[PDB]
Amino acid sequence: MSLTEQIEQFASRFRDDDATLQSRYSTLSELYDIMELLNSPEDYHFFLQAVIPLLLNQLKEVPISYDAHSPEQKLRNSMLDIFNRCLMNQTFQPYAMEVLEFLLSVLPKENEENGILCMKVLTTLFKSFKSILQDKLDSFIRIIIQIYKNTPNLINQTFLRSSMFSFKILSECPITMVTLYSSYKQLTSTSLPEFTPLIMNLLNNRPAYCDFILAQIKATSFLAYVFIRGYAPEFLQDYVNFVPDLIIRLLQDCPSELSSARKELLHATRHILSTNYKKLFLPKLDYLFDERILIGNGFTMHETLRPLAYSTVADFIHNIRSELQLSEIEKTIKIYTGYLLDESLALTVQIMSAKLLLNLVERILKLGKENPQEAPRAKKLLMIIIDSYMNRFKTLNRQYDTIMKYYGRYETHKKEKAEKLKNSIQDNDKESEEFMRKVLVEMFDIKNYAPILLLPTPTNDPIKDAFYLYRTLMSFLKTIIHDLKVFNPPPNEYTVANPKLWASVSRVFSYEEVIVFKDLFHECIIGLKFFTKDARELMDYLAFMFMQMDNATFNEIIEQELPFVYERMLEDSGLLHVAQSFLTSEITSPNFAGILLRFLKGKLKDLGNVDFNTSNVLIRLFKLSFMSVNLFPNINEVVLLPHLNDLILNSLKYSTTAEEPLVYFYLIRTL
Amino acid sequence: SNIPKNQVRVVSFFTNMVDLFNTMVITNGDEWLKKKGNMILKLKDMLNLTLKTIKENSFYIDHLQLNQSIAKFQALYLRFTELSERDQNPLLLDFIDFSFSNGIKASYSLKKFIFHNIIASSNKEKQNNFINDATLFVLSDKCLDARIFVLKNVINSTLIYEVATSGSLKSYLVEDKKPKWLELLHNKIWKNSNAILAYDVLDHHDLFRFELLQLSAIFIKADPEIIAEIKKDIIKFCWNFIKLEDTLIKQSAYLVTSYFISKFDFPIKVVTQVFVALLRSSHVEARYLVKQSLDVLTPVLHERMNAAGTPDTWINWVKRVMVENSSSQNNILYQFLISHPDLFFNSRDLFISNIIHHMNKITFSDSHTLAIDLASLILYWENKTLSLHLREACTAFLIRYVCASELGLRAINILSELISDVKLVYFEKFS
């Protein structure tokens, strides 16, 4: 059934086709029954040249266009399916030399199911030409230019199906200059109809048919598809300024019925924006304000092209980073922060947005440093983004209770998929040891239960996504609020005679900035419950994060939220590594020592009566306070000469009225 | 009185006002407007005044203190809304309020509320009139289609939370006495949103259609047995969206009619080409819709075929289109469409050898899973019952796959069953 046993059986088409109205079930057994699946023992050479006569005699039946489906015109696409699956190393000329006089009939006309045979067969003739180098690509490039000059007639009657892809990706390169590139450019300035510019007045259908508008934006689109491949190794000249307004003019009116062309329309934009001299003038000719979600008004189709629509623009703003004045970059933070906080996009798009937000910041201190009359607006500029970081991992603290639901589902799914490894064949011990022992409530999960869920339910580690987000965003937040220190006032207003003790230590903030510091600390110290060296990295990042924080403006966060940290410590014990990192090594352990002892002196009045847990926590917390007076002690030991005698005597009287009176004397020996 | 005399302190004039009133919520724990609400709608009007005058003028936009005090006013106003017994009229003036800006549902100062009237506690008899005034509000044409997307959130969230935290619509329909939202679903179907299925005028969004796709979809899940002529109106409403031009509305309504016809009201003029153009090649945006639609569809098209279904011509569609695909991602789409159903194809031996050739063309990554899973399919088929060279292609492919290279261990088990149902020298060939 791969030898001449076939040839003894498909004799029903030893003619071309008898009863030509019923060829589709009589002689269409070629690629649909026999050829598609057999073998390849070099047999195709023996009979494909013998069915080229059946090919051309079947090609006798394309006389007439205009809706003649059953004898002719779906048999046309059947012949498309005849051609489209052949490749060999012989006899290219008995196809190519006779195909085009059989394809000449269909190309200028477009109405009532034609305009496809020369093009879509020319995909197959094109790729069959790509395998070889017979040098007649310029010999039959002529009819393509004849199409591209037959276009204004066809848009004069019909107020296309060019499909410019598989003509000029030949890439042979002794090619011509002005006929090919003019065949590109002379479709640009063509109005789609004249009506749509009259539509264009109040965006910042009235044509009689709308299907032809689709057919012409598809051709002008495929124009914008091709000439990047005429650009990506290819330097261009004599015109560079016609492209930007053509790009946004092409994006602005594309129908919401389909955005599958918008995909690599947008790839065809990022190839332009990637290259060097086609970056700078697009601010000079579009000014970036036409790059909002006007490019996406088909939203049920433009909900799966939302990452690619913003990655090119964010990578473009990061790609220029030059001559960006302050108003457009504050525009970029006030849209990209919203793209961060918007939950529906992704995870990696959000981290890409945050990375974009940090990678601008050197132009914020450079730009605010060049003309310092508008310097504090660069500071508040620099803090809107940290507010957006705080809200971003403020949402995770709320999503906590169902994050552990899907994580418990994750290890109960992991332990039923990684348990199959344990019964492997490579074991080589058991038959030897046994030889020896022979010889001897759904809060948030609404979205995942809807009848149109549109994609599979997520099954990764939510914890590792959270830790990726914390290490990433905190890791940016260090050098952000570190680099806040270059915007400070001079000390002469502040009236301090310790000048070089500034410029790393003190800043000054308004109320609605230290609130966002406070809720940064609060909605980060809540965040540790997901997590333990991965926790310790965030302990170190928050600790190191608040060294640069103006300690008289640091003390007010920790006086008011140290009791919250305390009531968090009573459940998880690791957060002492927070407080340890605040007073075993700082500038300002002469502050956190005194604040910690003010808290513990207040909670020594009864607090040996209580259970083992908070007695263990407090008796560690004292010892971490007094281990900050033997490490440093050329520091304020005077932080401790008040309230240490009252600690002794009051630790005696509270021991005579306690319920477990030994913990006070153990506190005396650890003093 | 000092907003329109300067025009730039309006951020520092709204934030001070929600400062003062937010202070006076704290020192009067009951309420300091008798829990009646006259002091605070001046604040909502005030929010529209300062928000309008920042959208008008130039300099300061998206300050920190407006980003805070919107989320503060939101908290005290929305805190008032639960502190009254006319609980349904002030809920929606806020939805009229955020028409300009203010976050698409800045949550937990506005959405933590909206969860509290979702069906817990399980038989509270007040969310009925919430769904009633909600259904009158979504049909109000003269307000904010994006806030009708907000209305998807409230209405369809509380309905599918009812479906989730019950069997299927057990706690409603007290002998069908005053639902007063199913007859506004008769405003929905008996308007049809004619002519084009949403509003020829410039809408800027395509969401409301997908709302009625979901809200139409849930009742075929919920109550496919109670009032089935109403679900026939659900058919003739939902069958119309199939004639659209995108994909993931066409395959979404096509999904929900593919979900319907397993229940009742079976035609044959439609269903055949419904799953034929499910097994017709769609492109990669909503392949999972084709997965759940066809793989939940296909069992009832095996049982509602027979007693009139002696041919497997409906499976010959799968054979012929699997020939037509010009083997690519398109056939790979159909391989799990003969794998997610397994137990009832069992027709002929045409599926085997050509897909063994495909499955040889996989390994010339992320596609090996289908290749070994096909061997689990044939290993199911000779275990469902319990001409030689194709077995040499399968087994010899498995020898070449193990010798070539979690899933390979499963290939060892598949080989470990298949053989007791190449030999010597090929092992000589094997940083």
XYZ file of C-alpha atoms in Angstrom, chain A residues 25 31-33 36-39 84-85 203 256-258 260 263 293 297-301 303-305 330 334 337 377 380 383-384 387-388 391 398-399 417 420-421 423-425 441-444 446-447 449-457 511-513 515-516, chain B residues 15 59-65 67-69 107-109 115 118 153 156-157 160-161 164-165 202 204-207 210 213-214 217-218 221 245-249 252 255-256 283-286 288-289 292 320 323-327 353-354 357 406 409 412-413 416:
126
model
C -15.319 12.577 -4.046
C -3.468 13.981 -0.638
C -6.581 13.047 1.325
C -6.249 9.250 1.241
C -0.288 12.177 3.038
C 0.758 9.215 5.175
C 2.645 6.466 3.371
C 6.484 6.587 3.460
C 0.642 23.003 -1.213
C 2.307 19.830 0.149
C -11.880 61.230 18.458
C -12.584 45.434 16.531
C -13.798 42.338 14.658
C -10.219 41.048 14.447
C -4.957 38.879 14.963
C -0.279 41.145 16.853
C -5.356 52.272 24.780
C -10.632 49.176 21.377
C -11.709 45.592 20.672
C -11.144 44.525 24.243
C -12.374 40.923 24.110
C -9.828 40.421 21.327
C -7.329 41.102 26.262
C -4.776 38.566 24.973
C -2.518 41.170 23.325
C 5.559 61.806 35.264
C 1.140 57.780 36.393
C 1.986 52.392 38.143
C 8.574 67.889 42.293
C 7.393 63.681 45.002
C 7.718 58.826 45.893
C 4.566 58.163 43.833
C 3.511 54.361 47.009
C 2.725 52.065 44.100
C 0.026 49.155 47.302
C -5.111 40.737 51.525
C -4.901 37.782 49.126
C 2.725 13.625 41.084
C 5.545 8.141 41.099
C 9.319 8.707 41.175
C 8.571 3.331 42.539
C 11.291 3.533 39.900
C 13.106 0.550 38.435
C -16.138 29.680 52.626
C -14.755 31.113 49.387
C -13.622 34.708 49.827
C -11.861 35.496 46.557
C -15.303 33.862 42.529
C -13.274 34.297 39.329
C -15.767 29.327 39.341
C -17.366 31.429 36.590
C -18.739 29.482 33.594
C -16.458 31.362 31.188
C -13.071 30.964 32.850
C -11.242 31.415 29.530
C -7.946 29.766 30.611
C -6.870 26.966 32.992
C -6.830 27.436 36.736
C 2.921 64.042 56.320
C 1.589 62.203 53.279
C 5.097 60.831 52.708
C 2.391 57.924 56.155
C 3.468 56.021 53.066
C -8.126 66.298 51.818
C -0.824 71.683 36.589
C -1.322 69.187 39.452
C -2.638 65.736 38.482
C -2.439 62.480 40.524
C -1.072 63.916 43.735
C -0.441 61.650 46.724
C -3.108 63.181 48.934
C -4.805 59.118 45.957
C -5.208 58.794 49.730
C -8.354 60.846 50.392
C -11.282 47.368 46.504
C -11.681 46.578 50.229
C -12.900 50.089 50.851
C -19.024 40.725 49.348
C -23.428 38.211 48.646
C -19.267 41.928 39.277
C -22.992 37.547 38.513
C -20.614 37.335 41.475
C -22.126 32.143 41.026
C -21.325 32.402 44.724
C -20.709 27.561 44.537
C -21.957 27.599 48.147
C -19.949 54.522 20.253
C -15.924 52.247 23.913
C -16.263 48.762 25.505
C -17.381 45.247 24.545
C -18.135 43.982 28.030
C -19.891 39.085 27.734
C -22.958 35.562 27.981
C -22.033 34.690 31.579
C -24.593 30.813 30.909
C -25.112 30.263 34.642
C -25.586 25.220 34.963
C -16.656 38.001 13.620
C -14.244 37.587 16.540
C -13.158 34.303 18.138
C -13.589 34.352 21.915
C -17.105 35.638 21.796
C -17.783 31.564 24.139
C -19.222 27.077 24.296
C -22.439 27.795 26.155
C -6.327 29.762 16.065
C -4.487 30.275 19.318
C -6.350 32.629 21.588
C -9.035 30.421 23.106
C -8.964 25.956 26.077
C -12.509 27.001 25.151
C -13.742 22.246 27.503
C -11.000 14.015 7.309
C -6.054 14.771 7.213
C -6.697 18.399 6.213
C -4.595 20.103 8.908
C -1.193 20.093 7.073
C 0.328 18.685 10.243
C -0.524 4.721 11.924
C -0.655 8.303 10.602
C 4.024 9.203 11.905
C 9.283 11.698 35.070
C 9.766 6.529 33.364
C 9.359 2.663 30.484
C 6.072 1.506 32.015
C 6.706 -2.507 30.050
